[PDB]
Ligand binder design. Structure first.
Ligand SMILES: NC(=O)c1ccc[n+]([C@@H]2O[C@H](COP(=O)([O-])OP(=O)(O)OC[C@H]3O[C@@H](n4cnc5c(N)ncnc54)[C@H](O)[C@@H]3O)[C@@H](O)[C@H]2O)c1
Ligand SMILES: NC(=O)c1ccc[n+]([C@@H]2O[C@H](COP(=O)([O-])OP(=O)(O)OC[C@H]3O[C@@H](n4cnc5c(N)ncnc54)[C@H](O)[C@@H]3O)[C@@H](O)[C@H]2O)c1
Ligand SMILES: NC(=O)c1ccc[n+]([C@@H]2O[C@H](COP(=O)([O-])OP(=O)(O)OC[C@H]3O[C@@H](n4cnc5c(N)ncnc54)[C@H](O)[C@@H]3O)[C@@H](O)[C@H]2O)c1
Ligand SMILES: NC(=O)c1ccc[n+]([C@@H]2O[C@H](COP(=O)([O-])OP(=O)(O)OC[C@H]3O[C@@H](n4cnc5c(N)ncnc54)[C@H](O)[C@@H]3O)[C@@H](O)[C@H]2O)c1
Ligand SMILES: Oc1cc(Cl)ccc1Oc1ccc(Cl)cc1Cl
Ligand SMILES: Oc1cc(Cl)ccc1Oc1ccc(Cl)cc1Cl
Ligand SMILES: Oc1cc(Cl)ccc1Oc1ccc(Cl)cc1Cl
Ligand SMILES: Oc1cc(Cl)ccc1Oc1ccc(Cl)cc1Cl
Lengths: 289, 284, 282, 289
């Protein structure tokens, strides 16, 4: 049976969960990588059944979402040596161990073997609520460290543990290509680098492992992280539902099925791409009223 | 049960056929639209089992094979010279409008539309030496044809229905050899894919995309100018994936593009070319 | 002194004029190609000094010739347009004819400008456009650029330069810019690349296109499309300047100068930066 | 008379120097920011008239260039408070002071007044010789701090000290948009962020200061930096000279004159842009033989 590691799921409200669901539709088992400060919170809501409501696969619990494992993961660190004394001291990291990208890499591979799929649905900006102009070297590089370099780290450590013909997917946002005031802290710069890095990784992973990698430029989803920004997320959504060529409402599962498709053998000739999943809003010049 | 009309198949060596195959895999019934000057030959091949080897997916279910000339929007457009032409006389209802009426009357609303046709008489000429008539014909048969298909079919299409066409990267990067305004036609078709996505999306909740395919030894590709053998070899040498590109590779992306699983994708140019388009140039 | 041929000026309220003006600042002489059905009126208003207002800085106009970019050479003109009152007074107006006429009188020129479009169904949506309307938009607005280059480039100086004007509805959906015009503009930008390859290798001639913002030109005024677009550009572009005919003109002048001799095949945005925005910034 | 501050320059073999030259012929006065480690040498080269021939502009001989001033500048530091101790006690800096970004900006405003023009021609990355996949987070983030964030810091520190309608330009390279093996260390990512940043900065500089920013995507130049990587640069120059639509050799003043134009009021309505000065190589699909 096939497996996909989904780095960056903190609850059932994000894109990673939506991706997990659609992979369930085609019988691949999911391993989540959870950011440590919310790892217990999560494994708790999962034990109690708060997500059973969300593990329904359209045929209503005749088919379940197979969560093979859940692990602590801080893609901010590539291996143990990188971990600083203080984060080892933190009350949220005391309990937990083996959570560097290499740690979870090795762990999964030592137990489950080679896997086929790999998802990167995480990101973080310290100063996301600052304009790129008012952003500091530290915040900027933090955004980029957490949101861009993290994909590279994942590939480096995972892709030698993956099946030939395997596939990697990440999420991005169009602020990398067109100015969205409000998407700040160098998050636009991070996405811009992610997109570029997707191509360059496609070449190395393609030639070395025959592995594919693509990124989905998603439309606005009211996830937890999204919510953070005086409701920048509500505006992007009402702007989208109003002016997209497709007046539908965007679901996590819309991105979910495109990821599932990108992760399958059905797209074995597509690599290095930014595929837009935003109800066609990227094609528009502006509001059509 | 879902139906797709595939305009632009004349044998089993091109992309239309590969898309048909992949659509059969998910139980989609296929109607072929066939250029009349090649129609009776294609039907004979079919009838005598030449394509049987190539029908194996069990086997592809061809619901119908109709004559279609994507240069004619309706009956009145058809000149007498072709109405009197050896290869059209016995054939009727081959306007874009007439086959859309035909198909609609015989089967009702369809859900999927495939455009996989192109034509340009001066593709041997550099753009620079291409004539106004060559250039315009290339754009008439390869770009306008797409708008007309949509204009005539999309009244007769199920909401949430989907349209895909084929393109080539010659539109965005200079490929010498790809002439007669074919590079211009592909360009217009990519832009047109956008604009139709707005009108088709708002009006009928219909999606339209285009696949930028890599090189494939189709009969058309072969008729160009040794050129395609060079493009195939260059692709298999320098793509990120060194796999060999198959019609079914484009086929499965089209199928995905023609299904509700991509119901938030529209107006897009998708590259199915083994990653070739991301490279700067040769890596040796 | 260097010469620039500018096709697509029927008045002074457009981009072609702005390009002339800015070129005049550089001591480059200028030839106008004019759509015959307005050549008689243009020459008159130029007679009466009606244009002396805008000509000043002085714009030295070498010649004004009737040019119909619908016809590539003499034999393409059909019986009917020959027998039309709009043209009657005028001959030698095919792309080839004015190219020969210009070379015979002046020799090789250094600069070429394409600033003309037309389509007869620009009023209809792309989906509502017909084959003949669509193909007309493309013939006039797009192929013509290739016909100019084919005919003028053998008569140009090694190191010569060509520019045309385009609009962003080729890359992003602009309802209102219909009739296959978005379509013609998409071709034009692509063609700018392929042309750059051939012209560059064959004659060392560069070619670029400018993607310009809204201007209240004559042609723009028949669509209230352009009024809407100017308000939108002035409200949401990164720069608040009102866009000037001569802003495009000044980038043009640059592109036609040896100061840009490493730039070719490009689409250059001269639109106060508007292209770069996701949407209205309120 | 207008003044331009040119960041990355150190020997007249590069593009910073080429921009200097072409601004010169427009009678603009030029100031050099120079990386401290190479600063003493550059001034000893210059005051001994070694670049005396490179300062010549038609008419020749001659009509020379005249450098208003030359400062030390480490664009990897935003303000004094940043510059650490190890570096305070480094053989190259114990001899220099006021080289932080804000330090040099303040020094210039004080002494010269507001300036019209700003040029970013600086870049650096410790691990460029590594493929993106094999690149560490430190090397990667270094590439991006020095090569990209610099553009932002400069802009943050100079914008209030700049004339209304002032212009800024940086240099990029197509490896950000198409895979260029050999361009490792996260430089490709750096340039992608840079290009994206150019757009975002154009929004903020344009609204708040009526200030323009563009970047130039240049073709290969046998500069000192490009020399470092079995000659990546010789291959790239040859490739370009063979296959570009225009067969000429590309000179630092080719980019210099495009920059001078972008830095002048002739490009009044051009901002946010990536402009290609590469003899058209960017447009070709591949080798046309
Ligand atoms: N939501 C949208 O509107 C939208 C649009 C386009 C793209 N995206 C992208 O989709 C992806 C998923 O975002 P989402 O909206 O589902 O957010 P989310 O809040 O559902 O998921 C983000 C998760 O990443 C994890 N994370 C944060 N920092 C981490 C770190 N340092 N190490 C390891 N894990 C960390 C957190 O556990 C968090 O739950 C992100 O990359 C985002 O940029 C989102
Ligand atoms: N083969 C490749 O390498 C390649 C690569 C990229 C894109 N494409 C595109 O894929 C599409 C399919 O082409 P293909 O390579 O399968 O070639 P093909 O020869 O298999 O198919 C082209 C079809 O169009 C038909 N046709 C021509 N003129 C017509 C008209 N006026 N009306 C109706 N039909 C007409 C031909 O009979 C033929 O069946 C084309 O648009 C082509 O441009 C092909
Ligand atoms: N005005 C704008 O807002 C705008 C924006 C972007 C691009 N453009 C482009 O700039 C160019 C100039 O247009 P404009 O806005 O200055 O309008 P304009 O009226 O100044 O230019 C149109 C010119 O083309 C001429 N013309 C029409 N058909 C012709 C033919 N068959 N042969 C020769 N000439 C013909 C007209 O007589 C007129 O002189 C066009 O290519 C246009 O698409 C304009
Ligand atoms: N050389 C090329 O082929 C080429 C092509 C396209 C773009 N570029 C870009 O143009 C710019 C100039 O490069 P070049 O080719 O002139 O190389 P160069 O070596 O001539 O110039 C680079 C300058 O940056 C300086 N520098 C290095 N680290 C610095 C730091 N931490 N702080 C401040 N300054 C620092 C160097 O000392 C040098 O003066 C670079 O950004 C480069 O990426 C170069
Ligand atoms: O990428 C996103 C795009 C949008 Cl429209 C909404 C939310 C997104 O996700 C994030 C945005 C900023 C930060 Cl700091 C972290 C995350 Cl996960
Ligand atoms: O688009 C194509 C791209 C490639 Cl690489 C090969 C063949 C292609 O298809 C055509 C090319 C020219 C003409 Cl006249 C007709 C068609 Cl169908
Ligand atoms: O290209 C243009 C773009 C804009 Cl915003 C405004 C006017 C334009 O110019 C034209 C538009 C349509 C037609 Cl039929 C002819 C011309 Cl000259
Ligand atoms: O960007 C460049 C592109 C090219 Cl083709 C050549 C040199 C370049 O400049 C650099 C390349 C690498 C590093 Cl580490 C630093 C610099 Cl300044």
């Amino acid at each position: 049976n096939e497996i996909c590691f989904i780095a960056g799921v903190g609850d059932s409200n994000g894109y990673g969960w939506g991706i997990a669901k659609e992979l369930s539709k085609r019988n691949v088992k999911v391993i989540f990588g959870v950011w440590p400060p919310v790892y217990n919170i999560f494994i708790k809501n999962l034990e109690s059944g708060k997500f059973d409501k969300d593990m329904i696969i359209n045929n209503d619990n005749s088919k379940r979402m197979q969560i093979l494992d859940v692990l602590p993961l801080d893609a901010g660190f590539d291996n143990y040596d990188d971990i600083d004394e203080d984060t080892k001291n933190n009350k949220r990291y005391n309990n937990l161990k083996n959570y560097s990208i290499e740690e979870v890499a090795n762990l999964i591979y030592n137990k489950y073997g080679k896997i086929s799929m790999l998802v990167h649905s995480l990101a973080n900006g310290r100063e996301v609520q600052k304009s790129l102009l008012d952003t500091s070297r530290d915040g900027y590089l933090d955004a980029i460290s957490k949101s861009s370099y993290s994909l590279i780290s994942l590939c480096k450590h995972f892709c030698k543990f993956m099946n030939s013909g395997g596939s990697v997917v990440s999420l991005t946002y169009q602020a990398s290509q067109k100015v969205v005031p409000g998407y700040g802290g160098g998050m636009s710069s991070a996405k811009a680098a992610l997109e570029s890095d997707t191509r360059v990784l496609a070449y190395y992973l393609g030639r070395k492992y025959n592995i594919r990698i693509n990124t989905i430029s998603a439309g606005p989803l009211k996830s937890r992280a999204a919510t953070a920004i005086y409701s920048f997320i509500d505006y992007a959504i009402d702007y989208s539902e109003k002016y997209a060529p497709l007046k539908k409402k965007l679901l996590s599962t819309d991105v979910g099925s495109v990821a599932s498709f990108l992760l399958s053998k059905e797209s074995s000739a597509v690599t290095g791409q930014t595929i837009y999943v935003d109800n066609g809003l990227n094609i528009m010049f502006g509001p059509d009223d």
